[PDB]
């Protein structure tokens, strides 16, 4: 992985010291802006205060560019089969009566079914008139009862979380790392902000936008994958449409509870005296998810699933700029009094020359302790900060240049003296 | 629409004035004075759906 590439420093007004016990200690208190990095570049900071040894160090390293969703109506959908229950009556038996079966309604519980229970279940109650008299089951000339207590449940032991996607958000993976060695990693979108221990950051500038997804939803599945609809999204539950018994959570759908909703009337009745026949017609939610899984070809992008975060995303094959806003709200930074002198080499040089990658510089320290170290050049404008630990370790970063021929001689220090050091290489021309 | 700043200045912007709050627009979280915001004030208007949960 590559090191950091635009390196700015702190201002003066925003950020306070103090010196007590022989250990110079800052704050900061306020907001900086930055040119956010590419693939790979990481956006960095350096803090300088009231010595030259006394130098800490931000990093923010930009893993890749992605474009998030945003999500407004979600639910939980799954399969579901009807059980109904067969129990006919004659006539004055129980409750059977033509003004209360012709005004059925399906909250009422029936007389012949009160001893099941009221459990939290997607049931209803009917009762169909049918023949009576000795020709049929009875001993009155009067119209017998059918008594139908129909109550679904669920198929599959696993749910979907249909959702749909109003506007893209390009999202930029981030991973700060603190001052004191802490990595956090968050993750910025157009104008988003996330929170971190030394403040918060927010995205200002975005050349990105997918604009006109309302007429696609998206399927979510649990360890498996991703999915994607090209029909519109409705926010009303009818039948013969992807989406027709939803629910809040996967146990209401592997249960069916009564929280669920649904549209009136979808179980197909067939009375035949005795014989009970009870079919729906619902849709499979699982042959739109094997239909329509992730990547797919939609116009010119690619949509693919994620693996690491949560969400759906879309790739883009396309430059993109952005800026980083940096917020301070009152950070103790500290120092120390003595550093430990660094020794640094000179290893091998590489990559482009005016460009928005920059160049894989890498040197060899060695130290005998923990630290930084401060270097930079002769005019003024170019700084190298990498970590010094305990021994021989090869640190890399990125540094941009504006000749091919690179040839400029560097001080490097970490306790105060500096010491002379010269670098070469040769870089391609890359735009 | 203007945008005022106590101790720092003004500022403009070129789009119509935020009416209703709502998500992926510029003012989706309004109040009524400084204090409901430095403070919070709870009688501020929030949005449907906004903040997220992991």
């Known amino acids: 992985d590559p090191g950091c590439s635009e390196l700015i420093q702190a201002s003066s007004r925003i950020t306070t010291c103090s010196t007590e016990g022989v250990n110079t200690k800052c704050r900061l208190s ?51 089969s009807p059980k109904c229950l067969s129990s006919r009556r004659c006539h004055l038996v129980g409750e059977c009566h033509v003004n209360r079966c012709l005004s059925w309604r399906d909250n009422e519980t029936s007389a012949e079914f009160s001893f099941v229970g009221e459990s939290t279940t997607m049931r209803e109650n009917k009762c169909f008139e049918q023949c009576g008299g000795w020709g049929c089951g009875c001993f009155n000339v009067n119209p017998s009862c059918l008594f139908v207590h129909t109550y679904l449940q669920s198929v599959r032991k696993e749910a979907l979380r249909v959702f749909n996607c109003i506007d893209w958000v390009h999202k930029l993976t981030l991973e700060i790392t603190d001052f004191d060695g802490s990595v956090s990693t968050i993750d910025l979108g157009a104008s988003s902000s996330r929170f971190t221990n030394w403040g918060s950051v927010s995205l200002s500038l975005d050349a990105e936008g997918i604009s006109g997804s309302n007429s696609f939803s998206f399927i979510e599945s649990p360890g498996k ?106 950070f103790e930074v500290d120092f120390v009094g003595a550093a430990v002198s660094c020794d640094a080499a000179f290893l091998n040089l590489t990559g482009c020359y005016s460009c928005n990658a920059g160049a894989r510089v890498c040197l060899s ?15 003024g404008s170019l700084h190298i900060v990498l970590p010094s630990e305990n021994g021989t370790k090869d640190q890399c970063q990125i540094l941009h240049f504006t000749v091919p021929e690179v040839e400029e001689e560097f001080m490097y220090s970490c306790d105060g003296d500096e010491r002379p050091l010269l670098v070469k290489g040769t870089l391609i021309a890359i735009d």
């Open 365 to 379: 320290i060695t130290s005998t302790g923990t630290g930084s170290l401060s270097a930079h050049n002769k005019d």
């Open 225 to 330: 994958g991703y999915a994607i609809v090209d029909e519109p999204f409705s926010e009303i539950p009818r039948q013969g449409f992807l989406g027709e018994i939803r629910c809040n959570s996967e146990s209401s759908v592997l249960s069916a509870h009564e929280s669920c909703l649904r549209a009136p009337n979808l179980i197909s009745y067939k009375p035949m005296i005795d014989q009970l026949e009870c079919t729906t017609n619902l849709i499979d939610p699982f042959v739109v998810f094997e239909r329509g899984s992730l990547p797919q070809t939609r116009n010119d992008k690619t949509f693919a699933a994620s693996k690491g975060n949560r969400g759906v995303q879309a790739f883009s094959k396309g430059s993109v700029q952005a800026d980083l806003t940096l917020m301070f709200d009152n």
């Open 30 to 80: 306020g907001t900086a802006l930055i040119r956010a990095g590419s693939v790979g570049a990481e956006a960095c900071l350096m803090l300088k205060g009231v010595k030259e040894d006394q130098t800490k160090f931000l990093k923010i390293k930009t893993v890749s560019s992605e474009l998030s969703c945003r999500e407004g109506q979600s639910y939980w959908t799954g399969s579901f």
